[PDB]
Each structure stands twice: as structure tokens, then as C-alpha cells.
Design an enzyme around this catalytic site. Structure first.
Site, PDB file in Angstrom:
ATOM      1  N   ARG A  22     -16.714 -10.952  -7.556  1.00  0.00           N
ATOM      2  CA  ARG A  22     -16.580 -10.836  -9.005  1.00  0.00           C
ATOM      3  C   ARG A  22     -16.714 -12.191  -9.690  1.00  0.00           C
ATOM      4  NH1 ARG A  22     -12.176 -11.552 -11.845  1.00  0.00           N
ATOM      5  NH2 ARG A  22     -10.894 -11.472  -9.942  1.00  0.00           N
ATOM      6  N   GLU A  59       8.801 -13.338 -10.609  1.00  0.00           N
ATOM      7  CA  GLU A  59       7.800 -12.289 -10.776  1.00  0.00           C
ATOM      8  C   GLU A  59       8.323 -10.949 -10.279  1.00  0.00           C
ATOM      9  OE1 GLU A  59       4.560 -12.132  -8.196  1.00  0.00           O
ATOM     10  OE2 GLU A  59       3.135 -11.281  -9.632  1.00  0.00           O
ATOM     11  N   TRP A  81       0.476 -15.453 -14.634  1.00  0.00           N
ATOM     12  CA  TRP A  81      -0.173 -14.337 -15.309  1.00  0.00           C
ATOM     13  C   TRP A  81      -0.694 -14.693 -16.693  1.00  0.00           C
ATOM     14  CZ3 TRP A  81      -1.909 -10.266 -12.945  1.00  0.00           C
ATOM     15  CH2 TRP A  81      -1.289  -9.816 -11.771  1.00  0.00           C
ATOM     16  N   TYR A 107       1.719  -3.479 -12.242  1.00  0.00           N
ATOM     17  CA  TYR A 107       2.697  -3.187 -11.196  1.00  0.00           C
ATOM     18  C   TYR A 107       4.024  -2.705 -11.774  1.00  0.00           C
ATOM     19  CZ  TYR A 107      -0.655  -6.128  -8.631  1.00  0.00           C
ATOM     20  OH  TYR A 107      -1.796  -6.676  -8.090  1.00  0.00           O
ATOM     21  N   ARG A 147       9.215  10.197   6.257  1.00  0.00           N
ATOM     22  CA  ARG A 147       7.960   9.493   6.474  1.00  0.00           C
ATOM     23  C   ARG A 147       7.105   9.419   5.213  1.00  0.00           C
ATOM     24  NH1 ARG A 147       7.333  12.843  12.040  1.00  0.00           N
ATOM     25  NH2 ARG A 147       7.254  14.499  10.455  1.00  0.00           N
ATOM     26  N   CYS A 167      -3.814  -5.471  -6.523  1.00  0.00           N
ATOM     27  CA  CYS A 167      -4.281  -5.965  -5.235  1.00  0.00           C
ATOM     28  C   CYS A 167      -3.381  -5.491  -4.101  1.00  0.00           C
ATOM     29  CB  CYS A 167      -4.373  -7.491  -5.263  1.00  0.00           C
ATOM     30  SG  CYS A 167      -5.578  -8.093  -6.467  1.00  0.00           S
ATOM     31  N   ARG A 187      -5.453  -4.455  -0.908  1.00  0.00           N
ATOM     32  CA  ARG A 187      -6.888  -4.184  -0.926  1.00  0.00           C
ATOM     33  C   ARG A 187      -7.711  -5.467  -0.946  1.00  0.00           C
ATOM     34  NH1 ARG A 187      -9.273  -5.696  -5.437  1.00  0.00           N
ATOM     35  NH2 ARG A 187      -7.991  -5.916  -7.326  1.00  0.00           N
ATOM     36  N   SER A 188      -7.192  -6.524  -1.562  1.00  0.00           N
ATOM     37  CA  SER A 188      -7.926  -7.772  -1.702  1.00  0.00           C
ATOM     38  C   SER A 188      -6.958  -8.929  -1.533  1.00  0.00           C
ATOM     39  CB  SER A 188      -8.626  -7.851  -3.063  1.00  0.00           C
ATOM     40  OG  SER A 188      -9.375  -9.045  -3.181  1.00  0.00           O
ATOM     41  N   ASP A 190      -6.579 -13.082  -1.445  1.00  0.00           N
ATOM     42  CA  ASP A 190      -6.936 -14.490  -1.547  1.00  0.00           C
ATOM     43  C   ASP A 190      -6.151 -15.271  -0.501  1.00  0.00           C
ATOM     44  OD1 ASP A 190      -7.635 -17.087  -2.250  1.00  0.00           O
ATOM     45  OD2 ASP A 190      -7.372 -16.757  -4.398  1.00  0.00           O
ATOM     46  N   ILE A 229     -11.716 -15.960   1.953  1.00  0.00           N
ATOM     47  CA  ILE A 229     -11.409 -17.358   1.679  1.00  0.00           C
ATOM     48  C   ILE A 229     -12.445 -17.868   0.687  1.00  0.00           C
ATOM     49  CG2 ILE A 229     -11.443 -19.681   2.626  1.00  0.00           C
ATOM     50  CD1 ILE A 229     -10.038 -18.741   5.058  1.00  0.00           C
ATOM     51  N   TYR A 230     -11.990 -18.260  -0.498  1.00  0.00           N
ATOM     52  CA  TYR A 230     -12.901 -18.804  -1.494  1.00  0.00           C
ATOM     53  C   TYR A 230     -13.494 -20.125  -1.015  1.00  0.00           C
ATOM     54  CZ  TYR A 230     -11.551 -15.342  -4.982  1.00  0.00           C
ATOM     55  OH  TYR A 230     -11.356 -14.171  -5.675  1.00  0.00           O
ATOM     56  N   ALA A 284      -9.535 -18.599  -8.782  1.00  0.00           N
ATOM     57  CA  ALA A 284     -10.827 -18.100  -9.236  1.00  0.00           C
ATOM     58  C   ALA A 284     -10.593 -17.001 -10.267  1.00  0.00           C
ATOM     59  CB  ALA A 284     -11.648 -17.575  -8.059  1.00  0.00           C
TER      60      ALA A 284
HETATM   61  N1  LIG Z   1      -8.554 -15.596  -7.092  1.00  0.00           N
HETATM   62  C1  LIG Z   1      -7.313 -15.152  -7.498  1.00  0.00           C
HETATM   63  N2  LIG Z   1      -7.066 -14.637  -8.670  1.00  0.00           N
HETATM   64  C2  LIG Z   1      -5.748 -14.255  -8.864  1.00  0.00           C
HETATM   65  N3  LIG Z   1      -5.239 -13.689 -10.007  1.00  0.00           N
HETATM   66  C3  LIG Z   1      -3.891 -13.446  -9.831  1.00  0.00           C
HETATM   67  C4  LIG Z   1      -3.537 -13.862  -8.569  1.00  0.00           C
HETATM   68  C5  LIG Z   1      -2.155 -13.770  -7.968  1.00  0.00           C
HETATM   69  C6  LIG Z   1      -1.486 -15.118  -7.791  1.00  0.00           C
HETATM   70  C7  LIG Z   1      -1.806 -16.189  -8.645  1.00  0.00           C
HETATM   71  C8  LIG Z   1      -1.175 -17.434  -8.476  1.00  0.00           C
HETATM   72  C9  LIG Z   1      -0.217 -17.620  -7.456  1.00  0.00           C
HETATM   73  C10 LIG Z   1       0.445 -18.958  -7.299  1.00  0.00           C
HETATM   74  O1  LIG Z   1       1.193 -19.181  -6.345  1.00  0.00           O
HETATM   75  N4  LIG Z   1       0.113 -19.831  -8.264  1.00  0.00           N
HETATM   76  C11 LIG Z   1       0.515 -21.180  -8.479  1.00  0.00           C
HETATM   77  C12 LIG Z   1       1.299 -21.877  -7.525  1.00  0.00           C
HETATM   78  C13 LIG Z   1       1.692 -23.205  -7.748  1.00  0.00           C
HETATM   79 CL1  LIG Z   1       2.644 -24.024  -6.566  1.00  0.00          CL
HETATM   80  C14 LIG Z   1       1.306 -23.858  -8.929  1.00  0.00           C
HETATM   81  C15 LIG Z   1       0.529 -23.181  -9.887  1.00  0.00           C
HETATM   82  C16 LIG Z   1       0.125 -21.838  -9.683  1.00  0.00           C
HETATM   83  C17 LIG Z   1      -0.713 -21.152 -10.738  1.00  0.00           C
HETATM   84  O2  LIG Z   1      -2.058 -21.269 -10.546  1.00  0.00           O
HETATM   85  O3  LIG Z   1      -0.228 -20.536 -11.688  1.00  0.00           O
HETATM   86  C18 LIG Z   1       0.108 -16.537  -6.607  1.00  0.00           C
HETATM   87  C19 LIG Z   1      -0.525 -15.291  -6.774  1.00  0.00           C
HETATM   88  C20 LIG Z   1      -4.729 -14.372  -7.957  1.00  0.00           C
HETATM   89  C21 LIG Z   1      -5.066 -14.966  -6.645  1.00  0.00           C
HETATM   90  O4  LIG Z   1      -4.236 -15.120  -5.757  1.00  0.00           O
HETATM   91  N5  LIG Z   1      -6.353 -15.324  -6.487  1.00  0.00           N
HETATM   92  O1  LIG Z   2      -1.091 -10.478  -5.659  1.00  0.00           O
HETATM   93  C1  LIG Z   2      -2.273 -10.810  -5.659  1.00  0.00           C
HETATM   94  C2  LIG Z   2      -3.165 -10.705  -6.804  1.00  0.00           C
HETATM   95  C3  LIG Z   2      -4.450 -11.108  -6.703  1.00  0.00           C
HETATM   96  N1  LIG Z   2      -5.008 -11.613  -5.538  1.00  0.00           N
HETATM   97  C4  LIG Z   2      -6.461 -12.038  -5.523  1.00  0.00           C
HETATM   98  C5  LIG Z   2      -7.376 -11.205  -4.619  1.00  0.00           C
HETATM   99  C6  LIG Z   2      -8.715 -11.499  -5.283  1.00  0.00           C
HETATM  100  O2  LIG Z   2      -9.296 -12.691  -4.785  1.00  0.00           O
HETATM  101  C7  LIG Z   2      -8.364 -11.611  -6.776  1.00  0.00           C
HETATM  102  C8  LIG Z   2      -8.636 -10.319  -7.570  1.00  0.00           C
HETATM  103  O3  LIG Z   2     -10.008  -9.965  -7.568  1.00  0.00           O
HETATM  104  P1  LIG Z   2     -10.560  -8.440  -7.446  1.00  0.00           P
HETATM  105  O4  LIG Z   2     -10.712  -8.275  -5.841  1.00  0.00           O
HETATM  106  O5  LIG Z   2      -9.793  -7.392  -8.177  1.00  0.00           O
HETATM  107  O6  LIG Z   2     -12.106  -8.601  -7.901  1.00  0.00           O
HETATM  108  O7  LIG Z   2      -6.972 -11.923  -6.814  1.00  0.00           O
HETATM  109  C9  LIG Z   2      -4.196 -11.745  -4.389  1.00  0.00           C
HETATM  110  O8  LIG Z   2      -4.608 -12.192  -3.319  1.00  0.00           O
HETATM  111  N2  LIG Z   2      -2.867 -11.333  -4.506  1.00  0.00           N
HETATM  112  O1  LIG Z   3      -4.218  14.678   8.711  1.00  0.00           O
HETATM  113  C1  LIG Z   3      -3.071  14.770   9.144  1.00  0.00           C
HETATM  114  C2  LIG Z   3      -2.059  15.691   8.647  1.00  0.00           C
HETATM  115  C3  LIG Z   3      -0.828  15.714   9.207  1.00  0.00           C
HETATM  116  N1  LIG Z   3      -0.438  14.879  10.243  1.00  0.00           N
HETATM  117  C4  LIG Z   3       0.967  14.973  10.803  1.00  0.00           C
HETATM  118  C5  LIG Z   3       1.824  13.719  10.593  1.00  0.00           C
HETATM  119  C6  LIG Z   3       3.209  14.347  10.631  1.00  0.00           C
HETATM  120  O2  LIG Z   3       3.660  14.506  11.962  1.00  0.00           O
HETATM  121  C7  LIG Z   3       2.998  15.692   9.924  1.00  0.00           C
HETATM  122  C8  LIG Z   3       3.245  15.628   8.406  1.00  0.00           C
HETATM  123  O3  LIG Z   3       4.612  15.738   8.043  1.00  0.00           O
HETATM  124  P1  LIG Z   3       5.402  14.625   7.154  1.00  0.00           P
HETATM  125  O4  LIG Z   3       5.130  13.257   7.978  1.00  0.00           O
HETATM  126  O5  LIG Z   3       5.106  14.615   5.692  1.00  0.00           O
HETATM  127  O6  LIG Z   3       6.948  14.938   7.529  1.00  0.00           O
HETATM  128  O7  LIG Z   3       1.631  16.026  10.176  1.00  0.00           O
HETATM  129  C9  LIG Z   3      -1.373  13.963  10.773  1.00  0.00           C
HETATM  130  O8  LIG Z   3      -1.117  13.192  11.696  1.00  0.00           O
HETATM  131  N2  LIG Z   3      -2.643  13.953  10.195  1.00  0.00           N
END
Ligand SMILES: Nc1nc2[nH]cc(Cc3ccc(C(=O)Nc4cc(Cl)ccc4C(=O)O)cc3)c2c(=O)[nH]1
Ligand SMILES: O=c1ccn([C@H]2C[C@H](O)[C@@H](COP(=O)(O)O)O2)c(=O)[nH]1
Ligand SMILES: O=c1ccn([C@H]2C[C@H](O)[C@@H](COP(=O)(O)O)O2)c(=O)[nH]1
Ligand SMILES: Nc1nc2[nH]cc(Cc3ccc(C(=O)Nc4cc(Cl)ccc4C(=O)O)cc3)c2c(=O)[nH]1
Lengths: 285, 285
Positions: A22, A59, A81, A107, A147, A167, A187-188, A190, A229-230, A284
Site C-alpha cells: 500500500r 493504548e 494514532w 478496535y 472453545r 491488523c 493479518r499484517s 510490521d 519487513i519494510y 510507513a
Molecule cells: N507501517 C505501519 N503503519 C502503522 N500504523 C499504525 C501502526 C501501529 C503502531 C504504530 C506505532 C507504534 C510505536 O511503537 N510507535 C512509536 C514508538 C516509539 Cl518508541 C516512538 C514513537 C512512535 C511513533 O511512531 O508514534 C506501534 C504500533 C503501524 C505499524 O506498526 N506500521
Molecule cells: O497493531 C498494528 C497496526 C498496524 N501494523 C502495520 C501492518 C502494516 O504494515 C500496516 C497497515 O497496512 P495494511 O496491511 O492495512 O495495508 O500497519 C502492525 O504491524 N500492527
Molecule cells: O469444520 C469443522 C466443524 C466442526 N469441527 C469440530 C470441532 C469441535 O470438536 C466441534 C464443534 O463444537 P464446538 O468446538 O463449538 O464446541 O466440531 C471441526 O473440527 N471442523
């Protein structure tokens, strides 16, 4: 324990594949990773570089409150933020009607009011939506073997309204032998900036719910999707990769807290945290 | 590749912890697991026991159609959902007003109509909700580097209306070097019964979207939350652990398909599948 994170950094610098993203700078990316961090008598705060602990605590408190206002977190002294809540950044995504500081349904809104219709950041959603955080705490109290103890922040309906999609989108809790464990699906990731921040965040959340439900912290399982890793982080991570890891610190809660909302920043104390100096890693946008 | 599944069974029988569950029989449980199954020139259909391939294909087609009717899948010859859609089981959960066969808002409804108000199983939801499956296919076509290609079936709002909450709740797709990869987060895994079925299911889904988006299948990363072995599955799994694994079969699509909805069961052909005899493993209800 910390060797798993540094080992993930080594694997991405060596086996990572070039991949645009992105933002402007490319990445070295790996898809599918999992590390396990023990919470027993230690807190996983990285020692090869000083991790922003004050931002993690504030946070999470800002997350628990349900707030989607970057200014309320910035007022405490955490500007992480502010970038994603600026008039320039907000106008870019077509949210020109939106007031400055409103990150949209993020969140804090999804944790406490999942499914409610999002108005603005100053609205009152009490009684609206699904309170996932309290429902999680209740199930751990009454049915620990369940579960289905999941807190999900990924809402496909509210995706076009978010300044940045979640993320760390889904987490699940687990209880056995009076130990509470948590697995996070991110999901993502950094790997240089956010990942160390996210590890301490959900580890702190586990300590909070363990204190509430009267359990002992167990394991935090971090599951990554796109672990990247950027390019402008390669040099800082190669320096951190040379430093020798030191033993983890410890987290101590100072007063008995019964509700998750009644946690204050003064209730926590990190003991024995002797990290290497902070390493600058630019965000980034 | 198949040694990762058998290695997970091996790890749970040795280090698993006793844990009661929703059903009657307890389990041996482990929290937090991840295995990687390559899709390059092979299909991960287990060979140490014959996997119900006809059910995998038909259920996925039933998933893609968006149907929440267990009878519509049973008409094709797949009874795996009939149990959870019986008048006895439906009345137990308080869904006495519900007609027989309606599983509620489940995978097929969440994949194609996420966020819509669920009426009944015979309704028409065209134009309602978020079509996650098609949005996934479109993003892979136009922006493969996107880190937000996620299909989420876990809806906290629609949870009290489901006959069974989603076990494979969230999946994410990934593209690099013209290879499509998929990671599945499964909150609960029946290591003896469902897990082999789920592995082939989402591997088949990757082959479908790879055929549509003109990509080559890459890796399937299976991420487990509560990975559990039912007590009445210990003896059958100890037998399967003694069998020598045989090479994986291959999946061949026979006609060029352009839309995901136009896939028919006759379009697929499993070649070279020589598994060990089927091992009976009773389902816990
Ligand atoms: N690429 C990218 N975009 C992001 N948007 C949102 C996040 C999430 C995210 C963002 C920042 C931090 C963090 O510790 N920050 C800082 C730490 C120190 Cl020590 C000083 C300044 C900052 C700052 O810069 O404020 C932790 C998580 C995030 C990310 O981690 N990577
Ligand atoms: O808690 C957080 C929030 C954000 N990111 C990073 C992951 C990505 O590098 C970036 C968000 O970009 P998208 O993958 O949504 O494009 O922020 C984290 O690692 N941790
Ligand atoms: O695609 C599926 C559907 C069900 N289960 C199993 C996991 C659990 O043993 C049970 C679901 O019950 P709960 O975990 O919600 O109690 O079915 C799977 O492993 N895979
Ligand atoms: N405890 C528990 N409850 C479940 N509910 C839903 C599922 C999911 C689930 C259910 C069944 C199968 C499966 O291959 N079946 C069969 C295989 C053969 Cl070879 C023959 C008959 C059946 C049958 O069953 O007709 C795969 C996944 C499931 C599960 O796996 N475990």
C-alpha cells in the site's frame, strides 16, 4: 522466548520475497508464521530494543474504554494514532465530512459495540452492539472449557468506514490447569515497528483478564499472516539482530481490581526491565 | 507434508491435557498449532486413511452457493450436516420456531451475505450483505499485494442464531511469484474427524480461486486454536499413526471456468489417490 521473534527476523531477511505494498517502500514478506511466548512469571517486553511500554499500556486502556478518538489517547501522551487521524490523511480516504481525530469504527468500537450502527466518535453506544470483551470475561468465569471464547475486530460491514482496517483482527482465549492463554491472528505485521508493540499489548490484555477471572497467565500465541519487513527497516533490524537478548522483565499489578473498566495506568509496574537502547524505525504511512 | 498432521496427532497424544467439552466425552487438548501444506503439483488428501473426498467437493459447492439448508446438501448424498439440522437437535437449542434443515446464518450465508438480517433458509438475500467471496476474487485480480484479502465467517451479532458456531472462522489469501496461498484460522479442531476434512476443503478452495484468477496454487497454512482429540478417537488414531504415508494425489480441473459460481462437481478429477482403508471415527454431538 525472545529468540522466536529474532528468529522470525532472520528468516524474513534470508528467505523473504520482494513485495510492493500500500505504502511506497517495498517489503520482504513471508506468509504464515506462529510464535509462542510464555507469560509464566515473566512479561514479553523485548530487550534487544527499548519497547514503548507507556504506549502499550495507554493504548490498551484506550481500547478497553471503547474510544475511537485519537485525541483522547494523544492527550495521555501517545501520538501513535495521530498520523492516521489527521485532516490530511482523513481527507485522502474520502472522509471529508468526518471531524479530525475520528478513526471510525476501530478496535475500541468493535470490542464493546460490535454490530451497532456507527455514527461519530462522540456518540454513546452503551447498550448497543455486542460487548465482546465482557462476554469473553464472563465465559471464562462460568465455562472455561468453552472453545468459542473469541474477540473479533474484523467487521466486513464497517470496513469502508475505517481509517485503517484492523491488523490484529481476531483473538481467542483458552483455559487449562487454571492458566489463561491467548492466541492472536494478526493479518499484517510490521516486523520492525508494530509486531513488538502488539506482542506486549495482548500479553498485557491476558494479564488483565487473568487478574479479573482469578487465573494465572499462560502462553501468548502470536499468529501472523503477511509478516513483512519494510525496506527502510532492514538496517535497524540488522543492528538489533546483533544485540544479545537479556532476561524478560516482570509485570506486577498493585491493587486488586474486579472490573476490566476499573484498571488505571498507575496499577501496573514493570520490574527489572533493562533493555538495549531504542532503535528508530520510521512508520510507513 | 502429511508428517505435519501425523506429528500434530503425535504431539497431542503425548503432551495433550485432559479437558472436558461441550459434548460428553473429554478430550486431550493443545492450544496453538500451525502446519504448512504445499499445493504445488499435489493435493493434500490424507493417505493414511481414506478421506471423504465426495463430501469435501459437494460441501464446498454448497458453501459457494450460499445455502444454509442441510437438506440441500443431503440431497446430493452428504449427510454430515443432517445431524445438526434435525428436529431433536434444533429444538434443544431453543429453535423450535425454526423449520427442520435450517442451520441458521452459517458459512454459506456469511461468505456471500455478511451483515444482512437473517430471515429463514428459503429467503432470497441477493443484493444484501457483503459478498466476501467475490470481493476476495476481485482483489486478487486487481491488487494482489493487498494485505487485507480476508473472508471472515465469525459474526458476533449472528452467533445466538447459529446451530453451530463457525469452526473455520477466518481465512486470508496471499499472492507472490504468481502463487496463491491461503491461511485458515480454525478456532476448534476435531483432529480425528474434521481436521483432515477441513484441510482438503480449503485446499480445494485455493485451487478454485487460483483457476479463476489465473494463478498457481502455493501453500495452505492451517492455524489451529483448540486442537483436541476426542477420547473415543484415541484408538483409531493410534492405528492410523502406524500406517506408512503414501504420496499425495493430484487434482485436475477439466474445463475453463470464469465465475466461481459456475463450478460443477463433474469439473474435478482426483488422480493417483491410493489411501489406506477408511478408519471409523464417531462424531461427538
Ligand atoms: N507501517 C505501519 N503503519 C502503522 N500504523 C499504525 C501502526 C501501529 C503502531 C504504530 C506505532 C507504534 C510505536 O511503537 N510507535 C512509536 C514508538 C516509539 Cl518508541 C516512538 C514513537 C512512535 C511513533 O511512531 O508514534 C506501534 C504500533 C503501524 C505499524 O506498526 N506500521
Ligand atoms: O497493531 C498494528 C497496526 C498496524 N501494523 C502495520 C501492518 C502494516 O504494515 C500496516 C497497515 O497496512 P495494511 O496491511 O492495512 O495495508 O500497519 C502492525 O504491524 N500492527
Ligand atoms: O469444520 C469443522 C466443524 C466442526 N469441527 C469440530 C470441532 C469441535 O470438536 C466441534 C464443534 O463444537 P464446538 O468446538 O463449538 O464446541 O466440531 C471441526 O473440527 N471442523
Ligand atoms: N465433533 C464434531 N462435530 C462436528 N460437527 C460438524 C463437523 C464437521 C465434519 C463432520 C463430518 C465429517 C466427515 O468426514 N464425515 C464422514 C466421513 C465418512 Cl468417510 C463417512 C461419513 C461421514 C459422515 O459424518 O456422514 C467431516 C467434518 C464436526 C466434527 O468434525 N466433529
Amino acid at each position: 522466548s525472545e529468540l522466536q521473534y529474532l528468529g522470525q527476523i532472520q528468516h524474513i531477511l534470508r528467505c523473504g520475497v520482494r513485495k510492493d505494498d500500500r505504502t511506497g517502500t517495498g517489503t520482504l514478506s513471508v506468509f504464515g508464521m506462529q510464535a509462542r511466548y510464555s507469560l509464566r512469571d515473566e512479561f514479553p517486553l523485548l530487550t534487544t530494543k527499548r519497547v514503548f511500554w507507556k504506549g502499550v499500556l495507554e493504548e490498551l486502556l484506550w481500547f478497553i474504554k471503547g474510544s475511537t478518538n485519537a485525541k483522547e489517547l494523544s492527550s495521555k501522551g501517545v501520538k501513535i494514532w495521530d498520523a492516521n487521524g489527521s485532516r490530511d490523511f482523513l481527507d485522502s480516504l474520502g472522509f471529508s465530512t468526518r471531524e479530525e481525530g475520528d478513526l471510525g469504527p476501530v478496535y475500541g468500537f468493535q470490542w464493546r459495540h460490535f454490530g451497532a450502527e456507527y455514527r461519530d466518535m462522540e456518540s454513546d453506544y452503551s447498550g448497543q452492539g455486542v460487548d465482546q470483551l465482557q462476554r469473553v470475561i464472563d465465559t471464562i468465569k462460568t465455562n472455561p472449557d468453552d472453545r468459542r471464547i473469541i474477540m473479533c475486530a474484523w467487521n466486513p460491514r464497517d470496513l469502508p468506514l475505517m481509517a485503517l482496517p484492523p491488523c490484529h483482527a481476531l483473538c481467542q482465549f483458552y483455559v487449562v490447569n487454571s492458566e489463561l492463554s491467548c492466541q492472536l491472528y494478526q493479518r499484517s505485521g510490521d516486523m520492525g515497528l508494530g509486531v513488538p508493540f502488539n506482542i506486549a499489548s495482548y500479553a498485557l490484555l491476558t494479564y488483565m483478564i487473568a487478574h479479573i477471572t482469578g487465573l494465572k497467565p499462560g502462553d501468548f500465541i502470536h499468529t501472523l499472516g503477511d509478516a513483512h519487513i519494510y525496506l527502510n527497516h532492514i538496517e535497524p533490524l540488522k543492528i538489533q539482530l546483533q544485540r544479545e537478548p537479556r532476561p524478560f522483565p516482570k509485570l506486577r499489578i498493585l491493587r486488586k481490581v474486579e472490573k476490566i473498566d476499573d484498571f488505571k495506568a498507575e496499577d501496573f509496574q514493570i520490574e527489572g526491565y533493562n533493555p538495549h537502547p531504542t532503535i528508530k524505525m520510521e512508520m510507513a504511512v
